[PDB]
Amino acid sequence: HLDSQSRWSKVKDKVESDPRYKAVDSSSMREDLFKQYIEEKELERQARIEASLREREREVQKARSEQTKEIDREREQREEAIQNFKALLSDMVRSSDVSWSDTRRTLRKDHRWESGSLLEREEKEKLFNEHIEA
Amino acid sequence: PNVVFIKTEDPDLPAFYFDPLINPISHRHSVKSQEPLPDDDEEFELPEFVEPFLKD
Asked: What are the cysteine partners in each disulfide bond (chain B)?
């Protein structure tokens, strides 16, 4: 009656007389053969845990993809911030002869500039330059 | 009527198993009933001397 527990140290002294034990010309190999030989509701619960982990991984991947889509819709467009930057450049700025630094120093006194807090100064200056060029 | 159905994988699960697919149940923290309710002397005067619903 062998399972994964049973030790070869213990089984050996029980079968060492058989002609089928001696028939293996080596001790290293009688032990390997022994090691190989040694290896519903609970299995259902284990499959439950496995399917739950699989569904959880799939849902985590889908949520990461959706978060990436949202972050891309923000950074590639945060679309409201870029639209507000263009709108401030259209409203508070009308002459293309003014500079981006002077325009920023003038528009900093306005309350609409705070709406463009989510964007960096580099992107803001670039949008102001694009608006002045247009 | 979006027909939502929890399509299981294999018949190792029970029938009514919460598949980790939908959402957290409520994430409720505002409910607080750590102390016992007051209508216990009245509930103590309200026995249920008949057999249960579907024990069999």
From this structure: none
Number of Cβ atoms within 10 Å of the Cβ of A30: 19
Method underlying the structure: cryo-EM
Q: Is A43 in contact with B13 (CB distance < 8 Å)? A: no
- The span from the CA of A133 to the CA of B14, in Å, is 67
Resolution as reported, in Å: 7.8
Residues of chain A with C-beta less than 8 angstroms from the C-beta of B17: 48
Residue given tokens 């053969």 in the structure block:
A33
Tell me, what DSSP letter sits at residue B16? S
Pull the structure tokens for residue B4. 């939502």
B17: amino acid identity, one letter: Y
Chain B nearest CA to A51, separation (Å): 7
User: Dihedral angle at the C-alpha atoms of B38, B39, B44, B50, nearest 10 degrees?
Assistant: -140
Angle between helices A121-133 and A79-91 (to 10 degrees): 50
The Cα A16–Cα A30 span in angstroms is 10
Which residue among A43, A51, A56 places its CB closest to the CB of B9?
A: A51
Query: Any idea how long chain A is?
Result: 134
- In single-letter form, the type of residue at position A60 comes to V
Residues A93, A117 contacting (CB under 8 angstroms): no
Count how many Cα atoms sit within 13 Å of the Cα of residue A134 in the half-sphere of its side chain. 11
